[PDB]
Design a protein around this motif. Structure first.
Motif, PDB file in Angstrom:
ATOM      1  N   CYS A 316      -6.230   0.623   3.536  1.00  0.00           N
ATOM      2  CA  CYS A 316      -6.874  -0.691   3.875  1.00  0.00           C
ATOM      3  C   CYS A 316      -6.269  -1.885   3.196  1.00  0.00           C
ATOM      4  O   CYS A 316      -6.214  -2.954   3.779  1.00  0.00           O
ATOM      5  CB  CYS A 316      -8.366  -0.739   3.488  1.00  0.00           C
ATOM      6  SG  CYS A 316      -9.397   0.532   4.207  1.00  0.00           S
ATOM      7  N   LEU A 408     -12.964  -9.102   7.942  1.00  0.00           N
ATOM      8  CA  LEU A 408     -14.229  -8.436   8.287  1.00  0.00           C
ATOM      9  C   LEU A 408     -14.083  -7.236   9.237  1.00  0.00           C
ATOM     10  O   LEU A 408     -14.902  -6.317   9.200  1.00  0.00           O
ATOM     11  CB  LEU A 408     -15.271  -9.433   8.822  1.00  0.00           C
ATOM     12  CG  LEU A 408     -15.304 -10.052  10.225  1.00  0.00           C
ATOM     13  CD1 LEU A 408     -15.722  -9.064  11.308  1.00  0.00           C
ATOM     14  CD2 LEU A 408     -16.264 -11.241  10.243  1.00  0.00           C
ATOM     15  N   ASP A 409     -13.063  -7.262  10.092  1.00  0.00           N
ATOM     16  CA  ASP A 409     -12.708  -6.111  10.953  1.00  0.00           C
ATOM     17  C   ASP A 409     -12.377  -4.839  10.170  1.00  0.00           C
ATOM     18  O   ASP A 409     -12.598  -3.742  10.669  1.00  0.00           O
ATOM     19  CB  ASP A 409     -11.513  -6.458  11.849  1.00  0.00           C
ATOM     20  CG  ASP A 409     -11.834  -7.539  12.848  1.00  0.00           C
ATOM     21  OD1 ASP A 409     -13.043  -7.765  13.098  1.00  0.00           O
ATOM     22  OD2 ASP A 409     -10.874  -8.149  13.398  1.00  0.00           O
ATOM     23  N   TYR A 411     -13.420  -4.071   6.677  1.00  0.00           N
ATOM     24  CA  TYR A 411     -14.529  -3.502   5.865  1.00  0.00           C
ATOM     25  C   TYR A 411     -15.882  -3.339   6.612  1.00  0.00           C
ATOM     26  O   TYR A 411     -16.782  -2.637   6.130  1.00  0.00           O
ATOM     27  CB  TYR A 411     -14.708  -4.269   4.555  1.00  0.00           C
ATOM     28  CG  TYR A 411     -15.081  -5.717   4.764  1.00  0.00           C
ATOM     29  CD1 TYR A 411     -16.401  -6.090   5.070  1.00  0.00           C
ATOM     30  CD2 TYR A 411     -14.112  -6.722   4.668  1.00  0.00           C
ATOM     31  CE1 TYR A 411     -16.746  -7.424   5.260  1.00  0.00           C
ATOM     32  CE2 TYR A 411     -14.444  -8.057   4.868  1.00  0.00           C
ATOM     33  CZ  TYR A 411     -15.756  -8.404   5.161  1.00  0.00           C
ATOM     34  OH  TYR A 411     -16.063  -9.728   5.361  1.00  0.00           O
ATOM     35  N   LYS A 412     -16.019  -4.007   7.763  1.00  0.00           N
ATOM     36  CA  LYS A 412     -17.102  -3.730   8.733  1.00  0.00           C
ATOM     37  C   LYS A 412     -16.519  -2.949   9.945  1.00  0.00           C
ATOM     38  O   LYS A 412     -16.661  -3.369  11.108  1.00  0.00           O
ATOM     39  CB  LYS A 412     -17.838  -5.025   9.181  1.00  0.00           C
ATOM     40  CG  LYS A 412     -18.317  -5.949   8.056  1.00  0.00           C
ATOM     41  CD  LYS A 412     -19.766  -5.711   7.627  1.00  0.00           C
ATOM     42  CE  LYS A 412     -20.672  -6.872   8.031  1.00  0.00           C
ATOM     43  NZ  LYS A 412     -22.060  -6.766   7.492  1.00  0.00           N
ATOM     44  N   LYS A 413     -15.845  -1.827   9.641  1.00  0.00           N
ATOM     45  CA  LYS A 413     -15.251  -0.906  10.635  1.00  0.00           C
ATOM     46  C   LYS A 413     -15.797   0.508  10.466  1.00  0.00           C
ATOM     47  O   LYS A 413     -16.410   1.052  11.384  1.00  0.00           O
ATOM     48  CB  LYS A 413     -13.727  -0.885  10.531  1.00  0.00           C
ATOM     49  N   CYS A 414     -12.800   1.523   1.443  1.00  0.00           N
ATOM     50  CA  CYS A 414     -11.725   2.040   2.291  1.00  0.00           C
ATOM     51  C   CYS A 414     -11.781   3.538   2.585  1.00  0.00           C
ATOM     52  O   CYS A 414     -11.629   4.361   1.674  1.00  0.00           O
ATOM     53  CB  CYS A 414     -10.359   1.756   1.676  1.00  0.00           C
ATOM     54  SG  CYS A 414      -9.065   2.074   2.903  1.00  0.00           S
TER      55      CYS A 414
END
Ligand SMILES: *[C@@H]1O[C@H](CO)[C@@H](O[C@@H]2O[C@H](CO)[C@@H](O[C@@H]3O[C@H](CO[C@H]4O[C@H](CO)[C@@H](O)[C@H](O[C@H]5O[C@H](CO)[C@@H](O)[C@H](O)[C@@H]5O[C@H]5O[C@H](CO)[C@@H](O)[C@H](O)[C@@H]5O)[C@@H]4O)[C@@H](O)[C@H](O[C@H]4O[C@H](CO)[C@@H](O)[C@H](O)[C@@H]4O[C@H]4O[C@H](CO)[C@@H](O)[C@H](O)[C@@H]4O)[C@@H]3O)[C@H](O)[C@H]2NC(C)=O)[C@H](O)[C@H]1NC(C)=O
Ligand SMILES: Cc1cc(OCc2n[nH]c3c2CN(C(=O)OC(C)(C)C)CC3)c(C(C)(C)C)cc1Cl
Ligand SMILES: [Ca+2]
Ligand SMILES: [Ca+2]
Ligand code: NA
Ligand code: NA
Ligand SMILES: [Zn+2]
Length: 803
Positions: A316, A408-409, A411-413, A414
């Motif tokens: 990540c 944001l893509d 951690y709002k998906k 390490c």
């Protein structure tokens, strides 16, 4: 709606798929929600596991068990795979010495050796060596059969594009599966890993092997397995199908494993957790081979052990964000990760501009880990442009990195430590090939090759005619003991003219000038113009022209060319540079010299006035004046028939290739033969343009502007022999350089050419075959070598990756 209250009684893993809403019992029923009520009970038995033990030997048949150890099991074809080992004192296949399989040894009623494709997801090529201690069954297949040190996947190095390339022989741009995620703007539909749209047949183009087989009367087992079916049950189902009566039994089968990919994503390609998934895959191979041995099929079946792609270390924190480059990030849609694809968020936005997005993404940060491209500017070796599902803007991501739209893509998906999808020449993306069986060779190593070639070979293994595809049929003949496909060279379509001197200087009005000015040596210059040095410069015969056109062969002291009256320039120019050759410069008085060619009419010539008037366009030469054999021979290099249109930015690249790199290669390879020329591919389909497809001309003329320039550089594989006196196999490298008016692709281009040009050329490495498609030419027509060997040479790609 499925009326799921019919029954799978007797129908478990039936091969013909029944039509809705009658309920299904095939391995696809799970993903369609359509299995009959009793599918799990009847078809997915698990009682007592997958192995015989001493106390089960000779048991009374219990139809509840996953597999059987009762005396009747062999005739039923449903023993546990270790049955003969535990109960009958047999050895495991892996414990037997290997013995050459000279002929198929098949049970009566077998019309051909069956083919089993054993596919492993994410199986990186170096696992073969690095994991060999824990994979004894795979190691035996590898060492005893035919193996490559690695097999090159297609781009993008994702699962669905590569498995479907294996099944079809086609580039993703032609088969339609251009990524794991796709938007098709004609359908206005989206294809996703999760969901149902992906089963719709309109995504899947070409003709996959199971369809090619069925059309030609060869029965096929299913290739897709539902994720919830355990591997042991997949193997047992294949072994059961192999016990069907002759008229019902398939000839081609596939197994698929989601490992080691699944674990590689979590732990990285060499995480200590990776050992167990590799042991487990080897055990499954062992089960298949023990099962084949029980059925007396282990010296009858051809097995292919094959991966779809490798796996790289990716985490990540190694993510570039488009939000750090673009003001307008909310007006774009990105397909993210190990490649990037960009399109407008809204088709109503007429302030969306690809030009400004590309510029905001170009060389903006000192160590930037992706490079933006209009798709038609991607390296031609990727064959990744001719499909409406491939977005115009592409990002090539450096190995070990991701691209995303906004933080944001991510951690709002390490989570993960591995991924794949990168450029298919990257070492970590390479995968595996082993063939074992009566039709493959014994204990034989073959050079690395591309997975687009395998369809043809699987068709050969099954006596099928392949559908039209992107392999080069015959290029893998050296893998096979028999069933070779004996191709013939294509016929030349256009024969050349051989013009003599037909025009006086004053008939030309091209606006060109040149500062140009003994009977013994007069006959000498004449002989050169008739072809006396041609065997030196044209080493493998002249290329054949495989389409209808008008062209002239032109001979010179130092080079030979095929000159197109239609495109006003050579289609090809051939020359040999020995190890001993010397580089000279362009003398001062000859700097701007262009000379009319008295063999070629004014009407079929370029003119200098057009270049004077075109403020964007300059010109270069195909045979380089720097490598002239003498001051007198140098005049030939300035003929208007050796001139080609070149942007000044591109001439920086070309002049360095011709002045520095050709001589370097001749020094290193003990002489080289060079064939160079233009390519026109304005519609980016990978195929030669006709004259009515050309989008750009030198201003005010009919001189067409090439999209690319190629060179094919050949020498002796045994470099102790000079290129022009080679007794055996050849060695080749090639490139297809994009003909661009800027060097924006190269971030270090303000530096000396010694710091960036060769790096650019490596990126644009090519197969001779790629050049053939782009030019309609056929090279290597006259060598001492067998045609299949020449086919292998034409598919070679020099990768510039280390070991
Ligand atoms: C790699 O190998 C492959 C396979 O050999 C090579 O691809 C072939 O290239 C040929 C030339 O580009 C092409 O031939 C054309 O066929 C057209 C008929 O096409 C249909 O039928 C076939 C056969 O079953 C089928 O395979 C096709 O499938 C494509 O399209 C479907 C649905 O769209 C997809 O599901 C599938 O994935 C596939 O898509 C791919 O190909 C198409 C092109 O067909 C691309 O557009 C896609 O992006 C994608 O890459 C089809 O369903 C036929 O219509 C063509 O005929 C035109 O040109 C000839 C020239 O001889 C001329 O006589 C005619 O005038 C005609 O022109 C008319 O149409 C024009 C365009 O609309 C118009 O301008 C004119 O005015 C006319 O009206 C043509 O013969 C062949 O189909 C493909 N095959 C495949 C599988 O892709 C590929 O080239 C190789 N790559 C390299 C680098 O070597
Ligand atoms: C060997 C082979 C296997 C294969 O799919 C296997 C498979 N089963 N289940 C899954 C996959 C792939 N993913 C999703 C879950 C395919 C396909 C059908 C993908 C085109 C082609 C070939 Cl050539
Ligand atoms: Ca995969
Ligand atoms: Ca083209
Ligand atoms: Na100019
Ligand atoms: Na630059
Ligand atoms: Zn994966």
């Amino acid at each position: 709606w499925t009326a799921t209250s019919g029954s799978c009684k007797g129908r478990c893993f039936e091969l013909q798929e029944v039509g809705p809403p009658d309920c299904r019992c095939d391995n696809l029923c799970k993903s369609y929600s359509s299995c009959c009520h009793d599918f799990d009970e009847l078809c997915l038995k698990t009682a007592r596991g997958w192995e015989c033990t001493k106390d089960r030997c000779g048991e009374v048949r219990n139809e509840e068990n996953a597999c059987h150890c009762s005396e009747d099991c062999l005739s039923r074809g449903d023993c546990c795979t270790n049955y003969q080992v535990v109960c009958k004192g047999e050895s495991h296949w892996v414990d037997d010495d290997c013995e050459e399989i000279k002929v198929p040894e098949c049970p009566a009623g077998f019309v051909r050796p069956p083919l089993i494709i054993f596919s492993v997801d994410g199986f990186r090529a170096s696992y073969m060596k690095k994991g060999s201690k824990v994979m004894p069954n795979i190691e035996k297949l590898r060492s005893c059969g035919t193996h490559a040190p690695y097999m090159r996947p297609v781009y993008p190095t994702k699962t669905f594009p590569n498995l479907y390339t294996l099944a079809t022989g086609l580039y993703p741009e032609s088969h339609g599966i251009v990524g794991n995620s796709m938007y098709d703007p004609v359908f206005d539909a989206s294809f996703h890993l999760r969901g149902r749209e992906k089963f719709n047949h309109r995504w899947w183009g070409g003709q996959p092997l199971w369809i090619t087989a069925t059309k030609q009367g060869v029965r096929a087992g299913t290739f897709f397995w539902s994720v919830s079916i355990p591997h042991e049950r997949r193997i047992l189902t294949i072994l059961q199908w192999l016990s069907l009566p002759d008229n019902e039994r398939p000839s081609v089968y596939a197994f698929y494993s989601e490992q080691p990919d699944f674990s590689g994503h979590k732990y990285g390609p060499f995480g200590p957790e990776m050992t167990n998934p590799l042991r487990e895959i080897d055990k499954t191979v062992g089960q298949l081979m023990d099962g084949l041995k029980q059925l007396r099929l282990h010296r009858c079946v051809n097995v292919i052990f094959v991966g779809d792609h490798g796996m790289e270390d990716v985490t990540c924190d190694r993510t570039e964000f488009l939000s750090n480059y673009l003001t307008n990030v909310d007006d774009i849609t990105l397909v993210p990760g190990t490649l990037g694809r960009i399109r407008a968020k809204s088709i109503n936005n007429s302030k969306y501009d690809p030009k400004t997005i590309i510029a905001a993404l170009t060389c903006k940060k000192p160590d930037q880990h992706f490079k933006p491209y209009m798709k038609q500017h991607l390296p031609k070796r990727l064959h990744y442009a001719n499909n409406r599902r491939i977005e115009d803007i592409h990002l090539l991501v450096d190995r070990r990195w991701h691209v995303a739209r906004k933080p944001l893509d991510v951690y709002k998906k390490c989570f993960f430590q591995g991924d794949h999808g990168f450029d298919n020449k990257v070492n970590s993306m390479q995968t595996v090939f082993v063939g074992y069986g009566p039709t493959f060779k014994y204990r034989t190593k073959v050079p690395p090759f591309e997975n687009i070639e395998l369809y043809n070979v699987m068709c050969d293994l099954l006596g099928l005619k392949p559908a039209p595809n992107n392999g080069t049929h015959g290029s893998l003949n050296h893998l096979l003991r028999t069933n070779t496909f004996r191709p013939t060279m294509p016929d030349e379509v256009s024969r050349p003219n051989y013009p003599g001197i037909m025009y006086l200087q004053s008939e030309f009005d091209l606006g060109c000038t040149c500062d140009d000015k003994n009977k013994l040596e007069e006959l000498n210059k004449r002989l050169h113009t008739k072809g006396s040095t041609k065997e030196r410069h044209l080493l493998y015969g002249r290329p054949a022209v495989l389409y209808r056109t008008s062209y002239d062969i032109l001979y010179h002291t130092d080079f030979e060319s095929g000159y197109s009256e239609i495109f006003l320039m050579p289609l090809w120019t051939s020359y040999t540079i020995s190890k001993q050759a010397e580089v000279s410069s362009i003398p001062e008085h000859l700097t701007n010299c262009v000379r009319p060619d008295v063999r070629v009419s004014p009407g079929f010539s370029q003119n200098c006035l057009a270049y004077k008037n075109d403020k964007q366009m300059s010109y270069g030469f195909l045979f380089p004046p720097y490598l002239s054999s003498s001051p007198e021979a140098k005049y030939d290099a300035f003929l208007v028939t050796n001139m080609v249109p070149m942007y000044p930015a591109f001439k920086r690249v070309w002049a360095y290739f011709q002045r520095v790199l050709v001589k370097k290669y001749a020094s290193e390879r003990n002489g080289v033969n060079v064939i160079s020329g233009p390519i026109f591919d304005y519609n980016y389909d990978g195929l030669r343009d006709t004259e009515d497809e050309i989008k750009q001309y030198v201003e005010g003329s009919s001189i067409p502007v090439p999209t690319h320039y190629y060179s094919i550089i050949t020498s002796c594989l045994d470099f102790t022999q000079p290129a022009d006196k080679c007794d055996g196999p050849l060695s080749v490298s090639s490139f297809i350089l994009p003909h661009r008016p800027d060097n924006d692709e190269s971030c270090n281009s303000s530096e000396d050419e010694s710091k960036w040009v060769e790096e650019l050329m490596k990126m644009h490495t090519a197969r001779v075959r790629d050049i053939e498609h782009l030019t309609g030419l056929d090279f290597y027509r006259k060598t001492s070598r067998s045609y299949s060997e020449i086919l292998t040479l034409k598919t070679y790609l020099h990768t510039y990756e280390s070991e």
